[PDB]
Design a protein around this ligand. Sequence first.
Ligand SMILES: [Ca+2]
Ligand SMILES: [Cl-]
Length: 512
Amino acid sequence: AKTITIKVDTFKDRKPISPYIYGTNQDLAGDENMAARRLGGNRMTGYNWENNMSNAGSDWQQSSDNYLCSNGGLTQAECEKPGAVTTSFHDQSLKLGTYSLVTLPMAGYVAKDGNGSVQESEAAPSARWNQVVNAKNAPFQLQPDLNDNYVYVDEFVHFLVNKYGTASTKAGVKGYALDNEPALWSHTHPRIHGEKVGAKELVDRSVSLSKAVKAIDAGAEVFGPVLYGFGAYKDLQTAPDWDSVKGNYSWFVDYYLDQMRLSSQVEGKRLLDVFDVHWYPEAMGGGIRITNEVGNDETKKARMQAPRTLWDPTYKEDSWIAQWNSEFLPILPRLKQSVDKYYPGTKLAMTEYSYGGENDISGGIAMTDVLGILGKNDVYMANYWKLKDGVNNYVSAAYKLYRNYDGKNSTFGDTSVSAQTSDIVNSSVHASVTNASDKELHLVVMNKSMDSAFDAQFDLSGAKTYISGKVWGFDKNSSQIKEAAPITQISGNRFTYTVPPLTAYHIVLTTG
Ligand SMILES: [Ca+2]
Ligand SMILES: [Cl-]
């Protein structure tokens, strides 16, 4: 039985954990106690706020239909009301106490109807599509004109502010995203924007839309460019003008940051608040990409190690990104380096991600590590995307372990502190307090080994003596968070607890 040593120092590397890293796209079970929700992804590019219609693009028959009404739980009557998909979404955020991030359209057109598949010769402009205009430059209507050929984005923002107040208020919609995965427009939405997006095109569209939004609500946070993945981070998926605009930039991420900073200068207002990427691991194990299916034992092992690509300079995953682009890994410090240099003060968000194995312990353990990692790497917001429909039992378990570990919505602390482990392969560990507490300490620890328990020897540095602890966990036997045996004796702020294979625990220590 191997021993690992874990050192936790509550005085060291204190850093705020943004609550919006506990975020999602699709709501999960409903008891995860999320802090952020996103209305985004492929269906939002061609979503028409006036009639709630949208187009699935290449995900389903290039079909225009009422899917977002159905998915949001609206009645047929509610589906007729302007803005209803978004206002139903935001009402639910208000009920749950979450941030709302709402996607706005930039690819150029939105669904005019719900009449199904759009054929290639019916690409926009045609009877299947309305054109997007960023600024109406006419009086706004709360009941928009349903019979013309236009949707006006600022009129939609005005509608939301009319109903809820501004982003700076308690009830307001706080975030807007500049469409979704623009480097995939030509692939996902060929009937809307069939040409590959240009780098300069993307900036110009983004500046025009951001300015129109900011003119209605200066406090709203604008998120962009909502890049699908590393190919887009590198050169906007081979954008046709990349060689001509790349200059001395290392990758597209830098060009975009610097151009949005320059445009913000000219305009006299910040036009980009949060640099927004999607990250679906390319990490492979047992011949399978971890996001594709649960896989075999080697897939499951690779899934639990893959979170190290986010932070660990020593880790080299099996993927084309690590094979050909390792100088851009680990990815979170590299993104942060760029953002801090090319548009200082811009925040970072990962608005879709998934590690797969949704109903497997590997997927639960990967997520328990990822939520700790995001929290202590200066990520402002992060939103899981369900790659498998129906329940995602072990992903939900990971969220609950951090945000509702006791059934009473008790949570991990708001302040990250230093937690180190002697074995970064078989274990990960994250620690936190709230409001510099010297009375309560939270530790999330996990064993990634499929075969071998370890005895975790904890050495704690704190201002007060911790006297006891309670423990909650999930494992391969049960995705529900179960109370585990308590820690009844702690001597000199050290204690040992055994962590069985494939188990994650949240330990709460108290001074009494
Ligand atoms: Ca209209
Ligand atoms: Cl993209």
